[PDB]
């Protein structure tokens, strides 16, 4: 009877030629680091507590590839800290002298140039979950403010 | 009392003469399908795993209408595949020989002419959510690339 | 003294005109089914072991209504299997030729159209628990993969 | 090495002499109100349900100002309805006898002359968010159609 | 070997100059209130059962501050009901004549203006948990519909 | 069958001989920086917080090129600061003693002569995203006003 205009639906995805496929929940995910105190980030080299996040690989075929690694890409805080991600929320109110570090399963920070891959993880058939950690890294006396950062990752299958 | 120009706000919506009103989160929504492998789309008729998405109807009045169906409208991939969405990302980097299928609650792919409505769903008073699925449909050997599509829908009340 | 921006809280709920109200722990819930072997779903019509889940009704008034029934609404796997839920997780890595069946308190699989309600259960004043079961149903030789599914339910009072 | 013309980037922003700075997300935001039924706007004074939106203030310094208020500027629907936004999308297809009201944190509709400010909110150092609501206001029997509106705002720091 | 595009990760957090830091789970959290009957909200001042939620403070240093209090900020439902939240789901389908009240650990409803703080709770070193309650408050005869509300909070340390 | 003149459609594009093609969403993009306080740009060398923006590359073929770099072109603020974009919106209302800097993924401001390319990023097949940041740079005591700027970019595939 009564027909009414509704709305629109936008579909996002990607076709890849690879052993696995990144899960829909891992392609674009938000990691809540929570609040941190300036007293913790008092001087250069100070780190906060870590927050874990995962990249889940679906439909993995170990015949095609048995190892998977992840390289992250983003804007570094400066030239002397190539593994510290810079904060980019807005033009005002961001924290100063602090950035975000991404750790792979070996506990070491990853270079954010998109070429340095993480430690390879052996894959099984089906679902695979690559663990990662995120934490704040102080490049000096940290200043209060928002600390939001963004990075892209690419997966290597061997 | 320092007064400062702040910005601007744009309001979007629609007044409809219908038994239900589409929810604000369903009028415009993004469905993340995730990555898919070319090995799963190696020949015509090959489909992917489905991703669900809902259209929520608010303030439903069963005295006005008891059923609700949804018809989708979009660009078809071919003349013989009138139920497969074509991809619309950009002029480069898009996947080939693959499209998006919208499944109603019966599991059948809907025609995207804007006139073939879904299987009717009985409505209660108040909130109603109509389920749908999206999956990739291969029209041949799929090529790697971005797979983004979008469609509009209209709701019929009987 | 030192005041700091803390965060945000989101409140979700619903006001209904009904004899009972669904408990906050039953409006949305995750039912863990566990793993299942493909050897137990080797042909069409094969079913797995059942996992139980409950919908709790609070503040029931027997004067207003004495019996409660539940209907479930979700995407069906096929047109010949209108009582089998379709898997819904992501675009890659989900199991094929297998779905999820919801059983009412009589053991019969419920149709997922949202208009065929379960067996009516007599209610008492206050808390009421309506039992349900979920299991995997094979529409053929099932393949390995993720087996997630979602469905919404309606409550009818007489 | 192949050098190719890429494109253009446009940067928008504003320098202010104020205690706070409006966040980049609050400078130009779209508020999706969703659909509304005509039966909910059948006579003058009938309002719809509200949709919330925020204006975020960054880098707030309470030593400069401790309170913040917001005034909105837009085209009113009528002379006697100075707190109802007139709809403006195109020359055809718009709804009639209905507009948009902006409610401050006290729940009162704001006058849209750009001089009547909202209730002041105490500010803390750093990030501050000011809650607002939007709803449809009917000046008569609402007619179906598009219901888009636009309003600019300014922030007063005391 | 084979390298493919993955996805993107968004990190969200905040650096604060405070005695404690709000936990990652408390910065954003959804409180599920469940359903409520209209019969329990039949007149002004009628309240539903409370649902508990708590804000967790981490890395607390009792030398810096010994007590913490919370003030909530949201859109009030009326001028005479400053301690009752207003619903914000969509333009249609929301309940009328009912809001959300946030109760302190002393059982008193908090004023939603961001300046009236809760009762101070003495802090210990390490993890601290501030309990709160949420309930429905009726300003009249409540109407069936969705009841969703949003509130932001700030923490005071002294 | 009533036929009516409808309107006109303009198509903008470019054919390039390169390993990658710039995505339609990044050929002409608007970067909303937000607001900034004059107190944060009080003296020469003071910078604001950064805002991130990306240039997406499509249909990348690593057999043709494996590295990509971006150079930006625009009017500098003066001869001393060749890496600061001058502001341009109109004859009146622009901010004084402040410009816009573009940071590459290494966090270093780029020279705006159209020939100093950014740090090379390793490319994968298909979609590639090169990160960038924008921030305000004070050449003295900044004056309130509009702070819009425009720059073009070119991509070098080596």
Author numbering:
A (entry chain D), B (entry chain C), C (entry chain F), D (entry chain B), E (entry chain E), F (entry chain A): 2 to 159
Copy out sentences from the published article reporting this entry, exactly as the authors wrote them:
To investigate whether FimD is responsible for the increased stability of in vivo-assembled pili, we assembled FimD-catalysed pili in vitro (hereafter denoted as FimD-cat) in a reaction where FimDCH was primed by the addition of FimC–FimF. The resulting unfolding half-lives (t½) at 6.45 M GdmCl showed that the FimD-cat pili (t½ = ~1700 s) were almost as stable as the in vivo-assembled pili (t½ = ~19,800 s) and significantly more stable than pili assembled in vitro (t½ = 26 s) at 6.45 M GdmCl. Moreover, the dependence of the unfolding half-life on GdmCl of FimD-cat pili also displayed the same characteristic kink at high GdmCl concentrations as that of in vivo-assembled pili (>6.75 M). The melting temperature of in vitro-assembled pili was significantly lower (59 °C) than for pilus samples assembled in vivo (79 °C) or in the presence of FimD (78 °C). Importantly, the stability of in vitro-assembled type 1 pilus rods can be restored to near-in vivo levels by the addition of FimD to the assembly reaction. Our structures of in vivo-assembled, in vitro-assembled and FimD-cat pilus rods were resolved to 2.85, 2.69 and 2.52 Å, respectively. We modelled six adjacent FimA subunits linked through donor-strand interactions and refined the models against their respective cryo-EM maps. The Cα root mean square deviation (RMSD) from global alignment of the three models was less than 1 Å in each case (0.68 Å, 0.69 Å and 0.25 Å for FimD-cat vs. in vivo, FimD-cat vs. in vitro and in vitro vs. in vivo, respectively) implying that all three structures are highly similar. More detailed analyses did not show any significant differences in residue contacts or subunit–subunit interfaces between all three models.
Type 1 pili are important virulence factors of uropathogenic Escherichia coli that mediate bacterial attachment to epithelial cells in the urinary tract. The pilus rod is comprised of thousands of copies of the main structural subunit FimA and is assembled in vivo by the assembly platform FimD. The pilus rod is a right-handed superhelical structure composed of ~3.2 subunits per turn with an axial rise between two consecutive subunits of 7.8 Å or 7.7 Å for the type 1 and P pilus rods, respectively. All subunits in the rod are connected via DSE, forming an exceptionally stable fold that is resistant to extreme temperatures, denaturants and mechanical stress.
